[PDB]
C-alpha cells in the first residue's frame, strides 16, 4: 500500500541515539519504505533526518521507533506524578549539572517548605539508572502520543542541553559577557560571534571596532585585547 508515515518531510522531530539513549532535535528530510526482513516481514519506514546540533553528521537514517514529534509541552511541577513516563534532562557524567534529554519514569516526588525533590528511572542506551535525582524539575516534557496535536513545522520549542554557564545558568532572558558576547552580553547570532584563540571569549562581528561585515577567512583570530 502507499506510504503513510506518522511523520512527514520537513517535520520537526526528536531522534534517539541508540548508543547513549538521548533524544536530539532533528528535522525529517526524507521518508523511505523499509525492505521487510525475515521472518515476520513487517512493513516499516526509515526516516532520513538532519540534526540541529550535529550538521556534520549529514543526513542520518533512523529506525521509526527512534523518531517522534518534537517535545513541546512542559508538565508543571504540580502535575508531575510517580509512574509518569516523561522526557527530562539528566547528565550521567555529572548528575548535578545539565546534560541531555532522556525518557524517564518518575519514581518519587517530595515537597517541603524549603525543597522540591524529584527522582526518576532514566533510560540510557542499553540500561537504566534507577532513582536519579532530577535537577531540572520545571523542564519536564510530556512525551507526544502519535497523531495527537498538530505537527511542528515552524516556531520550534527550544530546549537547553549540555552543562550550563555558572554565571547566567543559560537563562535566555539574561545577558552574559562570559559565555556570550564579551562586549554586549547578547546570545543572538552565535554563528556570527568570533572566539578569541587566546582568551576564548566570544565577540559579535558587529560589536567589534571597526565592525566586520562577515566572519574572517583566516586560520585564526584574536580579540582586540589579546592582539
Amino acid at each position: 500500500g502507499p506510504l503513510g508515515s506518522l511523520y512527514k518531510v520537513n517535520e520537526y522531530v526528536d531522534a534517539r541515539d541508540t548508543n547513549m539513549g538521548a533524544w536530539f532535535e532533528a528535522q525529517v528530510v526524507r521518508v523511505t519504505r523499509k525492505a521487510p526482513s525475515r521472518p515476520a516481514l513487517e512493513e516499516d519506514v526509515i526516516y532520513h533526518v538532519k540534526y540541529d546540533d550535529y550538521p556534520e553528521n549529514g543526513v542520518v537514517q533512523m529506525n521509526s521507533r527512534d523518531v517522534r514529534a518534537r517535545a513541546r509541552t512542559i508538565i508543571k511541577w504540580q502535575d508531575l506524578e510517580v509512574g509518569q513516563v516523561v522526557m527530562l534532562n539528566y547528565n550521567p557524567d555529572n548528575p548535578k549539572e545539565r546534560g541531555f534529554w532522556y525518557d524517564a519514569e518518575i519514581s518519587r516526588k517530595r515537597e517541603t517548605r524549603t525543597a522540591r525533590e524529584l527522582y526518576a528511572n532514566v533510560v540510557l542506551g542499553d540500561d537504566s539508572l534507577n532513582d536519579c535525582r532530577i535537577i531540572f524539575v520545571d523542564e519536564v516534557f510530556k512525551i507526544e502520543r502519535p497523531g495527537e496535536g498538530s505537527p511542528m513545522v515552524d516556531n520550534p520549542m527550544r530546549r537547553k542541553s549540555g552543562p550550563s554557564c555558572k554565571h547566567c545558568k543559560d537563562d535566555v532572558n539574561r545577558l552574559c559577557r562570559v559565555c556570550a558576547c564579551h562586549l554586549c552580553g547578547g546570545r543572538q547570532d552565535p554563528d556570527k560571534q568570533l572566539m578569541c584563540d587566546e582568551c576564548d571569549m566570544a565577540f559579535h562581528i558587529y560589536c567589534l571596532d571597526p565592525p566586520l561585515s562577515s566572519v574572517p577567512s583566516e586560520d585564526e583570530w584574536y580579540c582586540p585585547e589579546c592582539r
Binding site: Y54, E56, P190, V215
Partner: protein, 35 residues
C-alpha cells in the same frame, strides 16, 4: 575513532556544538561514524 573539527575561525555556535559533541561522543558512549 572519528573527530570532527570545523576549519577556520571558531564561532560561538561551533564551540557550543563542540561542547555538546564532547559530552555525547567522548564521555557518554555515542559513536561517531564517517565515510
Amino acid at each position: 575513532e572519528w573527530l570532527y573539527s570545523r576549519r577556520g575561525v571558531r564561532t560561538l555556535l561551533s564551540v557550543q556544538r563542540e561542547k555538546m559533541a564532547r559530552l555525547r561522543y567522548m564521555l557518554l558512549g555515542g559513536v561517531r561514524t564517517h565515510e
